[PDB]
């Protein structure tokens, strides 16, 4: 129904991006004002893209995912390179960013106003990831009721910042926004970097997987729920940046590594160790949304020709996907012990917004060059055109921004095509190869005890 729809969207779309983002948004812009315009532009851009995915996924009506939206509007290897670049770029670098924030925010009651070694962080993040994966490889029934509690934890983590940020606003009228649009004299070649940091704050809608006859009166319920429960997030996310700027100047925020602890350290009350616990629980709630929605993606991709059938096999008792965990873990650990947040956001965001822009352009290409295949609801022609235009322009301009961290994503998606004809368009090039790879699947299927059920 309606209220459970806005509840599930408000639960999947907020998280801990509001603690990672506003330092990288301010750094790649100038003053407070350009930052707040970026934080409200990204909200309506995410609204437009969410409306486009909802209008696109109820016109194809297949078994979910925008892997099956690039396929059936492009067919071959455009949809192969998406599922290649997924498990090689996007998902390891997505887990290795929320984990790096989580590990940072629990070492704060032990390093009060002092500096932390990085190797103390990384070996705590690499404990939290494995505890997440061991929890996922056991029963799913505990793994969802834990998630519900972490959803209420991330709501309270937003709320205990948004309440004392307005009690400082209507009291004395404390203002340091004065000169709002006066920046640090230029930001034009690193504008899309801020686009990469704002959109990460709203991430989550592109795993929602809308299927038509499950919500009551579905001709009008889905776009109404999306447009209400996206503008609610845009309100709650701009007032939180107002709450951050109401107590911190624009120069303390660039030298700080955790803005939610310097908000609390000057807004005390003798339990200001609450917020590095609740920001940690909000960072854990996004980590726990891990191997799931990768598993059903592996199930759909394994059903045709891609991603060999050992993946999307299932443990016999306690029917949980183990080889997705096995293939995800030594990749996110490699990317975790490598470079920092500012490299990983760029390295994932390049490929991620490139493929979402391709899919929402394919929505238009299917709308005009196939005027059949009826629509339960439609959007105006300017909405996905504008979203795809901004996506592809920011991704293209991001190559003139730091190219030794995003150009590796470009060379990986261009080695996607020398990995396509070698593994899809061919027929058993050695016999030294198939008989070798059969024993591989046999041995590790025997070790993991996994069946395709």
């Amino acid at each position: 129904t309606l209220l459970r729809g806005v509840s599930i969207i408000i639960g999947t779309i907020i998280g801990a991006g509001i603690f990672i983002s506003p330092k990288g948004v301010l750094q790649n812009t100038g003053s407070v004002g350009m930052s707040l315009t970026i934080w409200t532009v990204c909200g309506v851009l995410s609204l437009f893209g969410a409306l486009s995915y909802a209008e696109l996924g109820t016109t194809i009506k297949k078994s979910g995912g925008h892997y099956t939206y690039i396929l059936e509007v492009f067919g071959p290897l455009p949809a192969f390179v998406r599922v290649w670049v997924e498990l090689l770029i996007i998902r390891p670098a997505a887990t290795a960013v929320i984990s790096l924030a989580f590990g940072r925010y629990i070492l704060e009651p032990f390093f009060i106003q002092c500096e932390i070694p990085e190797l103390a962080i990384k070996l705590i993040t690499a404990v939290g990831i494995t505890v997440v994966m061991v929890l996922n490889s056991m029963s799913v029934s505990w793994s969802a009721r834990i998630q519900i509690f972490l959803t209420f934890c991330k709501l309270t983590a937003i709320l205990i910042i948004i309440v004392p940020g307005v009690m400082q606003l209507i009291k004395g009228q404390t203002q340091n926004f004065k000169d709002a649009f006066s920046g640090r004299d230029s930001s034009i070649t690193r504008l899309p970097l801020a686009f990469y940091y704002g959109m990460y704050a709203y991430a989550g809608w592109f795993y929602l997987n809308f299927v038509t006859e499950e919500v009551e009166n579905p001709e009008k319920t889905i776009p109404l729920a999306i447009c209400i429960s996206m503008a609610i997030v845009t309100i709650g996310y701009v007032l939180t940046n107002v709450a951050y700027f109401t107590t911190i100047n624009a120069e303390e925020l660039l030298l700080s590594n955790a803005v939610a602890v310097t908000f609390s350290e000057r807004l005390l009350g003798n339990f200001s160790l609450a917020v590095p616990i609740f920001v940690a629980l909000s960072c854990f709630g996004s980590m726990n949304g891990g191997v799931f929605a990768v598993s059903r993606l592996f199930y759909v991709a394994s059903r045709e020709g891609h991603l060999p059938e050992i993946l999307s096999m299932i443990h016999v008792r306690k029917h949980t996907p183990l080889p997705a965990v096995i293939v995800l873990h030594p990749l996110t650990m490699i990317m975790l012990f490598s470079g920092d947040l500012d490299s990983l956001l760029n390295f994932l965001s390049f490929a991620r917004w490139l493929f979402i822009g391709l899919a929402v352009a394919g929505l238009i290409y299917l709308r005009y060059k196939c005027p059949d295949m009826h629509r339960p609801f439609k959007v105006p022609l300017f909405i996905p055109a504008l979203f795809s235009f901004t996506c592809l322009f920011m991704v293209a301009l991001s190559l003139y921004s730091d190219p030794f961290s995003t150009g590796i994503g470009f060379v990986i998606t261009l080695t996607g095509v020398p990995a396509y004809y070698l593994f899809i368009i061919w027929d058993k090039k050695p016999r030294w190869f198939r008989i070798m790879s059969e024993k591989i699947t046999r041995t590790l299927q025997i070790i993991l005890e996994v069946v395709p059920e």
Partner: protein, 468 residues
Amino acid sequence: GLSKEELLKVAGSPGWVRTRWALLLLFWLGWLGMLAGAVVIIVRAPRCRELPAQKWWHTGALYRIGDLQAFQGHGAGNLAGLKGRLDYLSSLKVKGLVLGPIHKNQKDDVAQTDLLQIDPNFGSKEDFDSLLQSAKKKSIRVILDLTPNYRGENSWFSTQVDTVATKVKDALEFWLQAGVDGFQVRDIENLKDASSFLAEWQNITKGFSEDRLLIAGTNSSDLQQILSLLESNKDLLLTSSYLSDSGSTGEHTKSLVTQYLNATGNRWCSWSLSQARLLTSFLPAQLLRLYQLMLFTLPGTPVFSYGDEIGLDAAALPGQPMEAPVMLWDESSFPDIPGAVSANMTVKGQSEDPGSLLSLFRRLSDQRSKERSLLHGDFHAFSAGPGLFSYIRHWDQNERFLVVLNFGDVGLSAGLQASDLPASASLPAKADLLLSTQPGREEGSPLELERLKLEPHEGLLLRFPYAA
């Protein structure tokens, strides 16, 4: 791929179950090894020292406004016009405000004059309340001077001493109820039994609250006359003329500052050149940038006079009182002898030049008030070239600062052989540069600390981070 029933009869074998129990225990031992390594890298971490919980007059500079009439202009010299300049004062980022004696005083009769009633030529009690509320809004503290005979020669009523002592006791209890943040008394060498009265006044000032100040001001240049005033007091800020006698060579000023810090025992002090004069009355026109770099980077509170940010000269202008020169806000401040001012002789003409003197004041007054190793860092000078003065500020692990000054008109190199500093903040090989007093160097260009060649009257503000 193997199906269900062909799998359970192979993966139930001996061997196949023992290898997976072995791999499971190997994975768990790697996990607990990572946990124990993270714990031992947390514990083997160096401690971190505790911040001193400073007061407000530790955090910035004080700005003495002696004559209020000549601060804005004649006819506009009331307390109401002072409210339009507090934005300019916050642009300077001064933390306090030492207002002049605004009380009523006629002349050498004590019975008519009174430290309780405001003179009507300055404003009202309601306007003083509005000043205090607007200053508390901008977070600028107001310190009220209370010298009794501030219109005359002998400021302390040299006939008797009892009534002038009792009336200050009534004065400190009166104004603190209104909400002032401190007090200042001047020329206390003309006050008999001074260290006994100062301890009583300091008691009353600390007895209202703990965040209140008392500033005493002498004219004595002698060190032993200064330490005798600091026998029963620790919280007293004492401004004297201790630095204004000489300083033509760097060895003399180096010996002066280090001897003062050795004698008082590294306590909180106040670095100033006078009690009511400007910087230009004791220095030539070229040394103002060097002394403004020095006075902001020394361990204590710097106290400046009004106009010292723009190089306000009185001897380079016509007929004026040498103790209370007129302030040059614009190109039309100085009314008579027209055309005497210039573009560089005023505030707004210096509020746009990047290589100006007021820009150096604003670049130093925020680095003093924001950075942590200049707030309460340590102090260690060392030997250097014959004519230089070089020192280092460092707090715990924060950004180390290095200041190198040239008190002479010669071309000298630095030659920094440290060899005696603590092992925490010893000299690095290469360090950055924040600013210089002269044009001709770019900001942010790291140097190596060997061929540091100095042009005459140059000062530097190198910095380097904590490493080993």
